[PDB]
């Protein structure tokens, strides 16, 4: 049962909006296509794929009951990148930089969740 809340508005109009504009965000706009990109064992290792395009669509269509669920999807996206790639890969450094901005924006979110 989806819902419209002050925090979900913030996730869409602050968090996603900010991250999408970052120069490191483009690997996360669409699902990882493991066959196109020649990624051995991607779906053997990553069983819960997530990407920012999916999160954006979920927010635009009121998929979430709570911002906590959307924050979970962001965490899945970042952690999948940390899990599949090697510790010093460029994409891991990009994901860490985006997660830093994510956490900064989350820190400024309204702390109590009100249905609108």
């Amino acid at each position: 049962p989806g819902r419209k809340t002050n925090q979900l508005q913030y996730m869409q109009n602050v968090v996603v909006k900010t991250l999408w504009k970052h120069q490191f965000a483009w690997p996360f706009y669409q699902p990882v296509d493991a066959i196109k990109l020649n990624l051995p064992d991607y779906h053997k290792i990553i069983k819960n794929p997530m990407d920012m395009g999916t999160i954006k669509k979920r927010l635009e269509n009121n998929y979430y009951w709570s911002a906590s669920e959307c924050m979970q999807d962001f965490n899945t996206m970042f952690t999948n990148c940390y899990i599949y790639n090697k510790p010093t890969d460029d994409i891991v450094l990009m994901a860490q930089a985006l997660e830093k901005i994510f956490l900064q924006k989350v820190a400024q979110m309204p702390q109590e969740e009100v249905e609108l």
């Binding site: 690997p27 020649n38 010093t88 890969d89 460029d90 994409i91």
Partner: peptide, 13 residues
């Protein structure tokens, strides 16, 4: 190699 996934270049560079 560190940019491999990025390349196609990002993942396999």
């Amino acid at each position: 190699q560190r940019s491999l996934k990025l390349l196609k270049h990002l993942y396999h560079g």
